[PDB]
Design a binder for these strands. Structure first.
Ligand SMILES: [Co+3]
Ligand SMILES: [K+]
Ligand SMILES: [Mg+2]
Ligand SMILES: [Mg+2]
Ligand SMILES: [Mg+2]
Ligand SMILES: [Mg+2]
Ligand SMILES: [Mg+2]
Ligand SMILES: [Mg+2]
Ligand SMILES: [Mg+2]
Ligand SMILES: [Mg+2]
Ligand SMILES: [Mg+2]
Ligand SMILES: [Mg+2]
Length: 74
RNA sequence: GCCAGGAUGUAUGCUUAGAAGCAGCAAUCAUUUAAAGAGUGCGUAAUAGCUCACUGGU
């Protein structure tokens, strides 16, 4: 019955990306780049907080958070 | 018109004493949907709160 809340998708991303802060211009300045297998884990870990059906959709959300903060996936 | 929803990653990222849809900057993705803007106004120190777009009902 004790709800353990997971860290925001954003911070989880910075962590995995090895960066102090996200980009101020997400489209122009890309601060870092990570991998799909990493978005994989973030989506898997954060899953309880999400409202997604599958992990593909979960990752779709995570990528959206990363896309909007200058992070890139490969 | 009235009734009811108007959600979720998320207080997006940045910046900023604070900046949580709504000072300002760059963006404006994604999920679950019948539908629901990275938010139309009002509101708060910042929250909260009221509200619209949008959806269903009558
Ligand atoms: Co939509
Ligand atoms: K703000
Ligand atoms: Mg109403
Ligand atoms: Mg209401
Ligand atoms: Mg939101
Ligand atoms: Mg922030
Ligand atoms: Mg400055
Ligand atoms: Mg803002
Ligand atoms: Mg509100
Ligand atoms: Mg304001
Ligand atoms: Mg602007
Ligand atoms: Mg809404």
């Amino acid at each position: 019955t004790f709800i353990t809340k997971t860290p925001p998708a954003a911070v989880l991303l910075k962590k995995a990306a090895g960066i102090e802060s996200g980009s101020g211009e997400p489209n122009r300045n890309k601060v870092a780049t990570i991998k799909r297998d990493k978005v994989r884990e973030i989506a898997e870990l954060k899953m309880p907080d999400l409202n997604a059906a599958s992990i593909e959709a979960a990752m779709r959300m995570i990528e959206g958070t990363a896309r909007n903060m200058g992070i890139v996936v490969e």
